[PDB]
Write a protein that binds this ligand. Structure first.
Ligand SMILES: [Fe+3]
Ligand SMILES: [Zn+2]
Length: 254
C-alpha cells in the first residue's frame, strides 16, 4: 500500500492510501479538499473513503466536499458519531475494518480529544496517530487527561519497533528544541534532532518516524529518565502519568 503525504494548511499532514492490488484509495484526515483534489487529479483515480482520526477542523475540513465530490465513504470513531462530518462507519476500539482486503486496527487513543482513534495497518507496519503522538511530543490535552494520554501512548508503543508513525503534524523541529532542553545527554535524541534540522532546512518531512525512534527520543515516552525529571522538578514519587502531565504543562508554556 502506497502512503502519500499531503501537507495541507501550514503544517498539517493528510495521507493518501493507495491499494496497489486494485484501485482502492482513501485519505486520512483531509484538512481541506483542495490538496486531496490535486493529488487524485494526478493519480488518475477517484476517492473511495475518508478516515478521520479526530474531529478537529484541521483533520475533517475537506470531508463533506470530498465525500459529495467523489461518492467516498467516511470512516471514523463511534464516540464522535455526531462530530465526524458525513461519517458512514462508526468504528469501535479493537474493531477490524478492511481497506480493500488490508486489515486496519481501530484503537481508541483519548487525550488530545475524547474519541480520538489511531489506525494501525499491520500489513504495512504503519499506524496513523493523528494528534495523539507526534515525533518528540504528544497532542495538546484539550479534552482528555494526562492519564488518558499516557494510556493511549502506551497502546501505540505496544506495537513492533519497526512500526512507522505518521505524526498528524510537522512539529518535529520545535518538539526537538523542547526535548533537547530536557534531555540533552541522550545522544540518540541529539543525533535525531540534527537530522530533523537538515530535512526541515530543505523543506522535507520528518514523517514517518518509528516506534523505535520515539521510544529512544520522545520525552513523553521517557518521563522516568532521571535527567528529564530533575530538569522539570518532577519528584521521584511521581508515577508515569504524573510525570507526563508535568512535561505537557511545561512544553505548552515553553
Ligand atoms: Fe491537528
Ligand atoms: Zn487536533
Amino acid at each position: 500500500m502506497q502512503i502519500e503525504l499531503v501537507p495541507c494548511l501550514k503544517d498539517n499532514y493528510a495521507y493518501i492510501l493507495h491499494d496497489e492490488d486494485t484501485g482502492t484509495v482513501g485519505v486520512v484526515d483531509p484538512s481541506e479538499a483542495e490538496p486531496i483534489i490535486d493529488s487524485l487529479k494526478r493519480s488518475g483515480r477517484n476517492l473511495t473513503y475518508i478516515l478521520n482520526t479526530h474531529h478537529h477542523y484541521d483533520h475533517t475540513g475537506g470531508n463533506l466536499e470530498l465525500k459529495d465530490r467523489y461518492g467516498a465513504k467516511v470512516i471514523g470513531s463511534a464516540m464522535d458519531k455526531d462530530r465526524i462530518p458525513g461519517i458512514d462507519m462508526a468504528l469501535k476500539d479493537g474493531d477490524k475494518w478492511m481497506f480493500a482486503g488490508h486489515e486496519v486496527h481501530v484503537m481508541d487513543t483519548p487525550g488530545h480529544t475524547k474519541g480520538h482513534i489511531s489506525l494501525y495497518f499491520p500489513g504495512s507496519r504503519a499506524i496513523f496517530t493523528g494528534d495523539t503522538m507526534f515525533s518528540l511530543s504528544c497532542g495538546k490535552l484539550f479534552e482528555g487527561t494526562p492519564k488518558q494520554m499516557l494510556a493511549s501512548l502506551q497502546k501505540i508503543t505496544s506495537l513492533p519497533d519497526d512500526t512507522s508513525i505518521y505524526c498528524g503534524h510537522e512539529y518535529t523541529l520545535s518538539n526537538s528544541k523542547f526535548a533537547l532542553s530536557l534531555e540533552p545527554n541522550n545522544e540518540v535524541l541529539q543525533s535525531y534532532a540534527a537530522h530533523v534540522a537538515e530535512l526541515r532546512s530543505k523543506k522535507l518531512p520528518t514523517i514517518p518516524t518509528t516506534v523505535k525512534m520515539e521510544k529512544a527520543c520522545n520525552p513523553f515516552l521517557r518521563s522516568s529518565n532521571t535527567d528529564i525529571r530533575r530538569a522539570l522538578r518532577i519528584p521521584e514519587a511521581a508515577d508515569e502519568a504524573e510525570a507526563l502531565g508535568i512535561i505537557r504543562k511545561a512544553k505548552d508554556d515553553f
